[PDB]
Amino acid sequence: GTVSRPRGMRPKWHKKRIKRLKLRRRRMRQRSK
Amino acid sequence: QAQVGLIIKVLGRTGSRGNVTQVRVRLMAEAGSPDYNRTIVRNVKGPCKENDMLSLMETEREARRL
Amino acid sequence: ETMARKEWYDVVAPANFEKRQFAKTICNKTQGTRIAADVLRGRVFEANLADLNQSAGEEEAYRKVRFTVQEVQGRNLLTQFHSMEVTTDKMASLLRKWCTTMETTVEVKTADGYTMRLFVVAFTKPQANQQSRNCYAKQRLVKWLRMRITKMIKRRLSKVQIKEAVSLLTRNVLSDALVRRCNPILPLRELRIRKVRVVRTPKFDAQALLSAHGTIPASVEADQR
Amino acid sequence: TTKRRNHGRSKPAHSRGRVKPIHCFNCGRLTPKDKAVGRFVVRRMLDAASARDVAEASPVYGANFPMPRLYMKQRFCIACAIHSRTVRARPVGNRKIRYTKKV
Amino acid sequence: YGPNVKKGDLVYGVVHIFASFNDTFVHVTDMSGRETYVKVTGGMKVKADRDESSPYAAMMAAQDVVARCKECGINALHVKMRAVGGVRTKSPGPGAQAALRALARAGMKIGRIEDVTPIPTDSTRRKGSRRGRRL
């Protein structure tokens, strides 16, 4: 409990997902540069 | 050897299924004995009531209160 | 067999206690280069103060005393005061909630060496007509009480010998003087010394230990049945 | 939805910022010392029958001399306080009842 | 093997009753603690791991201790009780009371009783996470 219904997964893990996505995109572009 | 004990009060049915009775028993011993009038809490199975008599195989164990 | 090689000994408290031959102990027989007296020295025996001073009352039953074995005299174990302590149950029971628990550590060396640490504990109390929900002490009064206790204990104990210091602590005249002279600072429910520990001993003296015990009672352990 | 005006703890908004946690007596969970459920327990070492048997064999203990007790300040996390029934969920009207003394 | 005292004189030991929630120790020493007379535990009396902390194993251990210490010559016992203490539980395990009762009933005299579980005036961090043990 302690919270209302989220739209999808737990927001902290969704934020962790987006973090890993940003790190991968940064690595990709540093590769192309 | 078995000591004889006299049930002096029924404290209530113990256990989850209600098949055990918790009773207070006084050890019926001869006067001048260490266990004379000594009382102890025992768990009993079977139909029992006040002033019934039990055969204690051991007199050192007391039943945990309920 | 394990106990067939064991011998019995008497532990002897110093002469300022009434029950001289408190406690009994066993040790291995001397065998080879391993001498019993050489492992016996340094053993520490704990005893209730009420057992040692039978003529004392109920407060003595809450204080434990430890003695260390200086020397072996036949089957007697000559001892010196090691430590003293309130029992855990009594100290735990002395605590209340809505009051200040003020502790003082005092370190004082007796007139013959023998540094000791005193560990004094005191409690505030409400006054007779007080209606307040607590009797917490102001920090200035706590520091003043601590300073006064330190001064009184150092002055009283640096002047005397180890045996007289032990007599002051066990007959708790020092604690009575402390509560009498410290109550004007703060009203005190209780001021007691919870533990005394000898922390530094002087070099071993034979004459001083023999003067600590006076008339040494005989040990019958060595004699035959 | 705010369940409690005190938010389950003794820390008003402008009293202090951080209260150092303690380990739950039962599970070890870290709990702010204000929030934890604190009980001071004075416990007999033996029940009445064991006490009688031991006092019969003791020159120290008897009617004149009481046997020692156990003293413990116990602080519980909320889950362990509820599970051990030292504290129970209460009806909304009864939640404001506070006891200041032991009863 | 006993001390050379008159008949019925009280020769004291100290019993260290260590009742955790996993086991029970009944340990008799002299009053300095250095020399051990006898040590019997619950696991010395039961076959199953789950039974060593129980009152019955503790009582059997206390009976053994009295049996051996009667031939040692010790007949009176000062008592030291402890829980695990330290940074773990201060509540004694189930077997302390039973061991002490069996000591008293089997014919030993009881002297001073004291509770000596180690209490920190401040401690190292206790096992488990900040979330505690999660069952």
Next chain:
RNA sequence: CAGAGGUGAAAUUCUUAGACCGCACCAAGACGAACUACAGCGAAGGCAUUCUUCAAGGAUACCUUCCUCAAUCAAGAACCAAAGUGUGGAGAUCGAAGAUGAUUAGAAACCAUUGUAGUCCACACUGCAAACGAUGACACCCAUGAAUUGGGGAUAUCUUGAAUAUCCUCAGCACGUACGCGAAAGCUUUGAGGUUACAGUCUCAGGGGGGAGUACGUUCGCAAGAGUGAAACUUAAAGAAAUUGACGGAAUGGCACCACAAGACGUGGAGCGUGCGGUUUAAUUUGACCAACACGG
């Protein structure tokens, strides 16, 4: 001297090369129990042993000084739990990663035994928290009772100045039961009141849900990342507070042989009667799947 540990029960692990346990010590690193509170201090983050020391900060007291010097904010600046980063140090405890043992359908988890990085210190970074009172700062008015912390003012008790008593007062953290407000939960001199009868002052942010605090650019950062921050596109709701039901491996109080306990007979195993289903058949007419199946008499 034969076990100890650990669990729901175990096993991993330790142990006659003496473990566990016992007494007194030694060393090292953390931490400062009980007292500890709807208590104190701090701008916030935070801060509990003692003593000695450095600078501060607030309140109170004042017929001291002074004379508008203020309030609040882009820009700029300083501080900031934990985790994390760098260089030295430390390394007891606990413990991300990992190892082993259990549990399980599987179990990379929860549980057990361990254990690296960490956890602690100095110096330098990072600048994010449910960094919360989810409530910006300054100022005014505002009902009642019991309290509490510090300082003052006036006039019963105890010790020998300290504390306590009664009353008042300024400042502080709060509690219970008035207006008034609010969608309500609730708030209430501690406003979320004094607002459609809408104006004391300054300032930050918001404008249906997602996409998304994502992309691109840029600044900062050793890095991790931080700050700033869209659109295409998609969607009719998302959301809030309360109400009544239903449900809960939540609590409490009761109850039942269509429940169990103590039991007695059976059934499930065989043969056979009967009903139901499958297969078959030209058709094997159909209904019914605890509350169908010797039921549709």
